[PDB]
Design a protein around this ligand. Structure first.
Ligand code: U2Z
Ligand code: U2Z
Lengths: 149, 149
């Protein structure tokens, strides 16, 4: 469970926001992309896995699960590619709630930012620092550190 | 020291590679950008600080130190902006050695990847996972976790 991530794709301003959630902590990384292609998803996973110890990724949909390019990136980066079927039904609600929260924060910034990508990274910052009391950023580091030891 | 990062800008294929190094661990994040502007550097720092607890950044040059946009990003993200003057002269050598190493890895993968940005992220992955025996990725998490506790 320290190495389990879930992909999530949401839309805003006619643009695509690709999100990776560290399931145990709620910590996220995100990027704005023109469209969710296998290539874009593969590149995003490469970046993620160079930065955190990504053991398993639950893909956000069947197209990214099927994608040879995504499979190739998972092979390259040593990631077990899995489906994202909500066997525990609460998983749908959790992801939906996060997308709502993220969009709310995006709305709260951007009087401040010209470009959506800046607003999305501001939202990532606020989400990961928010105390709920530890933050998601604190939880992910503690979870992974405990695993190392 | 858990929160201290150093910026580093290096060049390859007529392109700019912007690197942030976590000084205590040797862990890095990097991106390819068309040119090192204040705007690009500011955005890079925003991304970094949303992902790791960035307390202090030693800027890579005087232009980024001076930049109002970089100063604004540091304000936004709660980062202390500092110079990168090598008061300890070994710091020059360390950064140069890292740039050499990074370019070497890029060369080793360059044929697997069409685009330089992909090769750079492969290099980030290899660098952060390399056992020296802990990896830089392991060291950064342990350093920050110990600071939290
Ligand atoms: C790791 C990764 C990211 C992307 C997409 O940018 N492709 N791969 C990949 C995967 C396997 C082989 C070659 C490549 C490079 N094309
Ligand atoms: C945090 C950050 C990154 C960048 C550059 O993309 N600017 N800022 C910034 C900083 C302060 C205010 C508004 C903005 C938004 N322009």
């Amino acid at each position: 469970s320290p190495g389990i991530w879930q992909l999530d794709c949401t839309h805003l301003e006619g643009k695509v926001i690709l999100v990776a959630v560290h399931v145990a902590s709620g910590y996220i990384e995100a990027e704005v992309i023109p469209a969710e292609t296998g290539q874009e998803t593969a590149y995003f996973l490469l970046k993620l896995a160079g930065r955190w110890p990504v053991k398993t990724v639950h893909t956000d949909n069947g197209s990214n699960f099927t994608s040879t390019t995504v499979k190739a990136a998972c092979w390259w980066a040593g990631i077990k590619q899995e489906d994202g079927i909500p066997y525990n039904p609460q998983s749908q609600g959790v992801i939906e709630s996060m997308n709502k929260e993220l969009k709310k924060i995006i709305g709260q910034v951007r009087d401040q930012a010209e470009h959506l990508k800046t607003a999305v990274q501001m939202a990532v910052f606020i989400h990961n620092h928010k105390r709920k009391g530890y933050s998601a950023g604190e939880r992910i580091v503690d979870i992974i550190a405990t695993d190392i030891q």
